[PDB]
C-alpha cells in the first residue's frame, strides 16, 4: 500500500531548528502535490504548507512566512520540512499529505488522497 | 477595488473573469454555458416566410 511515513521530530528548546522528513512507499512523490497539516491537541488540523512540482510554487500560512522552508528531493522520493526560530506555539504532531491535483489546496484540505503516520515535535520556553 | 495578491509572481500562473447580470445573450455554440436553468425568456423571430406574388 502507498504509505507516507513521517519522521524528524523530537523536543527542542524555544528558538532552535528541527527537520521533518516523510517518504513514500509504493509510489514516488512525481505528481504529488505536498502539503503539511500540524494538530495541536485540544484544537482542530491547522494547515502549514504546501509545495508543487508542476509550478515549483511553496504556498506557506501566516504563521509560517519567514521560518519554514518546504523542499523536495524526488530522487530519494522524500518532503522534507526545516523549520526554524521554535516558539511554544509550534508543539504538535504533523503529518504531510500527497495528493494528485483536484485541487485540493483550497484554504483546509481536508481530503487526504494519501493519509501518513505523523511525528511529535514539542518545544520547550 | 484594485486589490494585490501576495505569494504569487508569475502572472499566467492564473487568469480573471468577467461577470455580468443583464444583457442576454443567443443559444450560441461558440460560448461557455453559465450555472443555473439557463433561461430567461424567449423571443420572436422577423422575417418570417409568407406567400407572395
Known amino acids: 500500500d502507498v504509505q507516507l511515513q513521517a519522521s524528524g521530530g523530537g523536543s527542542v528548546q524555544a528558538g532552535g531548528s528541527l527537520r521533518l522528513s516523510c517518504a513514500a512507499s509504493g509510489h514516488s512523490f512525481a505528481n504529488y502535490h505536498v502539503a503539511w497539516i500540524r494538530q495541536t491537541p485540544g484544537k482542530e488540523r491547522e494547515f502549514v504548507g504546501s509545495?508543487?512540482?508542476?509550478?515549483?510554487?511553496?504556498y506557506y500560512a501566516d504563521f509560517a512566512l519567514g521560518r519554514f522552508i518546504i523542499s523536495r528531493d524526488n530522487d530519494i522520493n522524500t518532503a522534507y520540512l526545516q523549520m526554524n526560530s521554535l516558539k511554544p506555539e509550534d508543539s504538535a504532531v504533523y503529518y504531510c499529505?500527497?495528493?494528485?491535483?483536484?485541487?485540493?489546496?483550497?484554504?483546509?484540505?481536508?481530503?487526504?488522497?494519501?493519509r501518513g503516520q505523523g511525528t511529535q515535535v514539542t518545544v520547550s520556553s | 477595488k484594485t486589490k494585490q495578491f501576495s505569494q504569487c509572481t508569475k502572472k499566467e500562473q492564473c487568469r480573471a473573469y468577467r461577470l455580468q447580470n443583464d444583457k442576454w445573450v443567443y443559444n450560441s455554440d461558440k460560448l461557455p454555458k453559465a450555472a443555473g436553468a439557463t433561461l430567461k425568456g424567449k423571443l420572436h423571430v422577423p422575417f418570417l416566410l409568407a406567400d407572395g406574388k
Open positions: 509545495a508543487s512540482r508542476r509550478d515549483d510554487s511553496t
Open positions: 499529505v500527497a495528493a494528485v491535483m483536484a485541487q485540493t489546496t483550497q484554504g483546509w484540505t481536508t481530503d487526504y488522497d494519501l
